[PDB]
Write a protein that binds this ligand. Sequence first.
Ligand SMILES: [Cl-]
Lengths: 206, 203
Amino acid sequence: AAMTLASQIATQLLDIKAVYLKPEDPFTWASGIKSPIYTDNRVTLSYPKTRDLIENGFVETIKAHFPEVEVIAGTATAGIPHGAIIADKMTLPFAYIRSKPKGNQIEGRVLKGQKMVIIEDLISTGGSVLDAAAAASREGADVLGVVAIFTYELPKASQNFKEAGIKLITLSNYTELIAVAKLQGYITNDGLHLLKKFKEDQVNWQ
Amino acid sequence: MTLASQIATQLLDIKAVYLKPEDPFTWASGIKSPIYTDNRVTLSYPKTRDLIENGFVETIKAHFPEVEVIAGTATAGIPHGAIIADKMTLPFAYIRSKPNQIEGRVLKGQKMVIIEDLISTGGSVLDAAAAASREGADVLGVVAIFTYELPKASQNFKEAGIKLITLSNYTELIAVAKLQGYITNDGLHLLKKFKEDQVNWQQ
Ligand SMILES: [Cl-]
């Protein structure tokens, strides 16, 4: 009970296998990339204890970073369940933002100038949630920022958010998760070393 | 007012439902419809959303006390189902519209209530229901915000052998529309005829 929120979330993600770490037997991602990590935080939705931790963490970080928020928008599709729960908990309007149109991406009703926080599940490059913010801004939102469950901490995501001028907060992150994984025996020191290389360079980490 | 008429009053007010009997919408099938529904806008009105989500919880708590997972139909049923699951401290999952269609984790034989925002023919949610069943869920039933009360939907559900519960319905909603002046008696008559016959109601 003395762990950071980031570390508590990582503990539970590993425990419920929302995240698997197999640095010495890696996954193949799309695009021919081998990865020591697989993430599916939609699994958290099926574990009320973990889900409550995450949704309560989101509400707390939003109040802290974006107290003037007027609308909670979830990124289609993975960010939607979390966003809806957050909006219910804060007694705020909810909207969601499609990946593409069927004046067409926001579902719900958002007033011009309404202050929005956008909810995302996972940040890799941030491209998806950044495009969501772009669509929201086109349709009249005042986007305060983004909150996500987790980030791979890729330098490219930092660059994307900075260049876009959009604040990102995350509840947990790659560094805390691989740290907790080793502490808890999910990975060996050799595995931890490989995971650190993966953050540095996704192509030549092996 | 009953919960159904309360819901309907708020759907009309926030323009989640548009009634145009004298100038109908056209459906993919070619049917002209006096009604358009977008219940996603309920999500942006906390008073209305609270009423709907609490309504869902009560009816699930009564009709499906053995439910072990709440599943939302992608995409419009997802936000409602997620809030329902949070309120009930239950597992949540959701079901993709097309192909592994269950997202989340559902074990074999886990008892599932499926959440939908609108029943027109019921085809989408029944496709959701078959996919979840193929993947091991024990589908208990479907609950939806609103139904057009189409005979096609009734027969679809009876054939599939699946219970449908709804919070509000076409008949009660067009009654509130007339009472509140959103339609005239002529429009109400047209709306009633559409429900009895979707092909010949303008004749
Ligand atoms: Cl539509």
